[PDB]
Ligand binder design. Structure first.
Ligand SMILES: Nc1ncnc2c1ncn2[C@@H]1O[C@H](CSCC[C@H](N)C(=O)O)[C@@H](O)[C@H]1O
Ligand SMILES: Nc1ncnc2c1ncn2[C@@H]1O[C@H](CSCC[C@H](N)C(=O)O)[C@@H](O)[C@H]1O
Ligand SMILES: Nc1c(O)cccc1C(=O)C[C@H](N)C(=O)O
Ligand SMILES: Nc1c(O)cccc1C(=O)C[C@H](N)C(=O)O
Lengths: 341, 341
């Protein structure tokens, strides 16, 4: 049936309805004051009535809102976000899609065909990875880590629940960005110390996250290039969070070997990110989020299969290699291994 | 559950997967040569292996392709397009989404706030409707109508099947574009005459449509402004195809009154386009296609409701006013009426 083409042929428009729903304050409004009529929505949102009608038609047909005798409410996929304390997280992730992902996504066909991250051209600069370009635009690094922070809040419950974190003591957070996961881990397991290793630009943001959490004594930053610099010794566990998806298999094996060398004997390596199913059928989230990785971060970036990741861990010399499957609707999991005593 | 958000939060990426499948020739390849392995796909499409895997993961998770034992075929929605002779139509429509709609869709929020078609900025020029800007880029106007021609082919079965065309003799096709519907009508009704009224630039494209159909005698072009020029007299039937969606309700009443005066007593008026359901719940297609209309053609464009259109015909003096429902997966119909004899 051809009808299945509708959410795909108009997929960009479907995203724009959610985008508009968020930016214009519709979902917050319906949460607090629903049911509301179309006129009431137009008055509260200070929109022309035609505009309100267009938005409401879009969100209602998508199931993001419901209408009942002319009265509008949040649909359950939106209500769920508010229920689970995730509305600011979803809001910030949609802003990321809008400000970072959407326009470079137009360069997807070219990026596939040329094997480049072509969409990076929408960001001023000359280097070939997104992260080293963030400093070129005032406020851009902060905007980026706001989104990345929210992405991690969404995805890291599987990380925080990892059994290793009730055994390990000292965690090296490689490319740990703004310390979102370091702080979450520190709060979840109070005996952990964590070192957040990243570029100076990112650690500038990480310091604010750590200070706000009041965790200066348990979470520290460390400026280093993940490829060209030595990792700090004395760590019990090496964490790659939302990191190996950026690089080639060849590059990841290099990083996992550095991890092996740096982790103490008996220690753990943990790879936390989205994963592609080994049968290459999905999940849908990963298959679609690949458009971002194909177009922006780096010319090799992609959401790798579980099995390929486990393969790299063994080749790096880790033993007892395995995986923890997603507990929910996102495709995030953990691949883990041990350095032999 | 938040899981329902995946095709919307990543909706732009879903479109890009369809977009890439089309442009890179995947769906034609799988149609002719399926099943193929990922390697055979990469070789045939001249993609790096990583790129082929990313693409194939995307199309398969979406159901645009299927995989069995590593062998890839077109999935149901794509197969159905080839089956029904619609593959060239879908290809050209996806190219229109890519080249015309996608980037202006990002101006949706601004368009909603200001009640302007703010996405028109992606096109060189200064005038306030998309169509008068088309001539400013070499090949753009012909590119537009290639897309529009395909939209019309996809949607006009309900038009062609209209009983009226067995009872009328001379159709004035108001804003008839590249004559796609005039020609389809004339082929289906061998004694029907049609006048395609549009801008000079559109009629230059319509000339080729008409020529390649050999319908010079029965299908003619008439350069005129639909608002400011007189409609030529002597026509039995006034047709608005994909036209009233561009304009405000007030402008449409103006147009329908002109249609009334110009049509012979006893004559018919037909309005053919996408329609929004009277209860404002959808259809999804219309609710999403509205992002295009909001961002690009004109500051008032929108997919109007059946009942509002019917209302206009009656106020313009037409009687025996009624509608013809969509006989399938798209939201296209005909609202029609008569001038009293
Ligand atoms: N060459 C390099 N040296 C150090 N850090 C790098 C790097 N290339 C990329 N990174 C870091 O890799 C991170 C990718 S985003 C993931 C950040 C964090 N782990 C989280 O889950 O939220 C960015 O913070 C980026 O600065
Ligand atoms: N002021 C105007 N005068 C004449 N034609 C106009 C116009 N404003 C818009 N149009 C025409 O309205 C048409 C909208 S696109 C629809 C074209 C055709 N009826 C089809 O169904 O395929 C374009 O061809 C555009 O040139
Ligand atoms: N934006 C990212 C990045 O630059 C690197 C790694 C991950 C990300 C992410 O946004 C998270 C990703 N969408 C996920 O949900 O797995
Ligand atoms: N592109 C259009 C236009 O400029 C004017 C009127 C209609 C159109 C369309 O593209 C057709 C619309 N997508 C439909 O399927 O009904």
């Amino acid at each position: 049936e051809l009808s299945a083409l509708v959410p795909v042929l108009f997929g960009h428009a479907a995203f724009q309805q959610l985008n508009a729903g968020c930016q214009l304050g519709l979902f917050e409004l319906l949460h607090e004051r629903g049911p509301l009529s179309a006129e009431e929505v137009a008055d509260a949102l200070r929109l022309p009535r035609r505009s309100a009608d267009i938005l409401l038609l879009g969100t209602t047909a998508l199931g993001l809102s419901t209408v009942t005798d002319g009265g509008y409410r949040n649909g359950a996929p939106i209500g769920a976000a508010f229920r689970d304390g995730l509305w600011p997280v979803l809001r910030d992730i949609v802003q990321y899609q809008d400000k970072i992902a959407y326009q470079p996504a137009a360069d997807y066909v070219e990026s596939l065909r040329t094997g480049q991250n072509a969409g990076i051209r929408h960001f001023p600069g000359t280097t070939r990875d997104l992260y080293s370009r963030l400093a070129a635009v005032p406020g851009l690094e902060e905007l980026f880590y706001r989104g990345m922070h929210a992405w991690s809040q969404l995805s890291n419950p599987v990380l925080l629940a990892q059994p290793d974190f009730t055994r390990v003591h000292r965690v090296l957070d490689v490319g740990g960005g703004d310390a979102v996961n370091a702080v979450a881990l520190a709060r979840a397991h109070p005996s952990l110390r964590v070192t957040v290793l990243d570029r100076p630009g990112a650690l500038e943001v990480a310091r604010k996250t750590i200070a706000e959490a009041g965790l200066e004594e348990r979470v520290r930053t460390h400026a280093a290039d993940i490829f060209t610099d030595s990792y700090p010794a004395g760590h019990d566990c090496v964490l790659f969070a939302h990191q190996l998806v950026i690089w080639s298999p060849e590059q990841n094996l290099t990083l996992l070997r550095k991890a092996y060398d740096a982790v103490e004997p008996g220690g753990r390596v943990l790879v936390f990110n989205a994963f592609t199913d080994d049968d290459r059928t999905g999940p849908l989230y990963a298959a679609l989020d690949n458009v971002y990785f194909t177009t922006l971060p780096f010319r090799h970036s992609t959401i790798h299969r579980w099995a390929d990741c486990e393969s790299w861990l063994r080749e790096a010399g880790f033993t007892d290699v395995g995986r923890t499957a997603p507990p929910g609707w996102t495709p995030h999991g953990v691949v883990s291994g041990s350095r032999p005593r």
